Design a protein around this ligand. Structure first.
Ligand SMILES: *[C@@H]1O[C@H](CO)[C@@H](O[C@@H]2O[C@H](CO)[C@@H](O[C@@H]3O[C@H](CO[C@H]4O[C@H](CO[C@H]5O[C@H](CO)[C@@H](O)[C@H](O)[C@@H]5O)[C@@H](O)[C@H](O)[C@@H]4O)[C@@H](O)[C@H](O[C@H]4O[C@H](CO)[C@@H](O)[C@H](O)[C@@H]4O[C@H]4O[C@H](CO)[C@@H](O)[C@H](O)[C@@H]4O[C@H]4O[C@H](CO)[C@@H](O)[C@H](O)[C@@H]4O)[C@@H]3O)[C@H](O)[C@H]2NC(C)=O)[C@H](O)[C@H]1NC(C)=O
Lengths: 51, 102, 154
């Protein structure tokens, strides 16, 4: 998720090598945007990384 | 002083109170990370029935009761509404906190 | 010492909120399914009256657990109600739409009336559905993908 206050772009990460990587384009709006990767599942731990 | 009393699913090895409850492997959580991959035979249980909030994001329910099991004092007659009367009787219940504490 | 439970008289009634018409009552046995489906709404309320006796000298035997549970086949939701033993030795149940709106959380659908009865001293844990009653009232998953709508070039 590419969020500013609310998500502008949500995409599925795709596996290559050993990493989930995706390439896309940045929307027209300027500001401070952050990437939230939040993986929450039934049984797994909660993953959360925001840059 | 309460117990998960069930009158349709009691094992033969009981004290005549039907306190022992045989829980089937159907009403489980159905997540292979918690309850393992294999197929399980019906399990045995003798304990106090708890309940959890339906709109609770953190709580889990590893093993609910059966369809007719109720939790109330085995000696006293039922006067109030019994706590966790149906399939919302919880037997095994887990929590995964915000710090990932199991 | 164990005992064998038995159900003697069961009356499925459809009472109308209006006084003028008399209620229509239909009787059924213990291992049976009622013919047709009853309806209960704002205009008509549901009523069931039953009596339980022992096989031998069944002087008003009262089981420890007697819960009337309605299972919704379409959505899976089920609701369990207690049984009230009036001093005439008659267990009675009255299903209202305005009065018991909160129990069903105001949801209209077709329910099945299962009756659970049996206790520590009874021999057989009865479970037979009386009839299909129609009641009508007045996070861990991927989210939806979003794509950005760019500005149209002139
Ligand atoms: C000055 O400061 C101000 C304060 O911050 C700034 O104001 C803020 O500005 C932003 C954006 O300008 C606003 O966000 C938007 O609000 C829109 C209308 O609001 C609805 O809000 C409710 C719905 O939102 C709820 O959603 C759930 C529901 O529970 C809930 O979890 C959530 O928290 C929230 O409560 C609703 O109740 C109201 O009635 C309103 O309908 C809303 O439509 C916007 O959503 C857009 O955009 C977001 C991200 O931008 C997307 O995630 C959405 O899916 C939706 O996306 C649409 O537009 C995108 C690009 O525009 C497309 O890429 C999408 O595909 C999608 O396109 C569809 O819709 C288009 C029509 O719009 C169609 O043309 C398309 O074909 C698609 O069908 C967004 O939420 C803030 O509300 C606002 N805040 C305040 C306080 O005013 C202000 O911007 C600052 N000034 C400047 C100059 O920047």
């Amino acid at each position: 998720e590419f969020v500013r206050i609310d998500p502008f772009v949500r995409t599925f990460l795709k596996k290559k090598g050993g990493k989930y990587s995706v390439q896309f384009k940045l929307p027209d709006v300027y500001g401070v945007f952050q990437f939230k990767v939040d993986y929450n599942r039934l049984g797994y731990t909660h993953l959360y990384s925001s840059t | 002083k309460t117990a998960v009393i069930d009158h349709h699913n009691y094992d033969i090895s009981d004290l005549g109170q039907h306190t022992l409850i045989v829980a089937d492997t159907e009403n489980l959580l159905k997540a292979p990370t918690i309850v393992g991959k294999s197929s399980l035979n019906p399990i045995l249980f003798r304990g106090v029935g708890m309940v959890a909030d339906p709109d609770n994001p953190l709580v889990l329910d590893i093993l609910t009761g059966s369809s007719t099991s109720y939790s109330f004092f085995p000696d006293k007659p039922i006067t109030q509404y019994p706590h966790a009367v149906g399939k919302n009787t919880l037997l095994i219940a887990g929590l995964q906190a915000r710090n990932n504490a199991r | 010492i164990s005992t064998e439970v038995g159900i003697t008289n069961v009356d499925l009634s459809t009472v109308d909120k209006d006084q003028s018409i008399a209620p229509k009552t239909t009787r059924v046995t213990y291992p049976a399914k009622a013919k047709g489906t009853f309806i209960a709404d704002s205009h008509q309320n549901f009523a069931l009256f039953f009596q339980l006796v022992d096989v031998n000298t069944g002087a008003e035997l009262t089981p420890h657990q007697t819960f009337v549970r309605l299972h919704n086949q379409k959505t899976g939701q089920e609701v369990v109600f207690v049984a009230e033993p009036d001093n005439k030795n008659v267990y009675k149940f009255e299903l209202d739409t305005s009065e018991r709106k909160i129990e069903f959380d105001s949801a209209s659908g077709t329910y099945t009336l299962y009756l659970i009865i049996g206790d520590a001293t009874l021999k057989n844990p009865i479970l037979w559905n009386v009839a299909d009653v129609v009641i009508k009232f007045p996070l861990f998953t991927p989210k939806q993908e979003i794509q950005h709508l760019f500005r149209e070039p002139e």
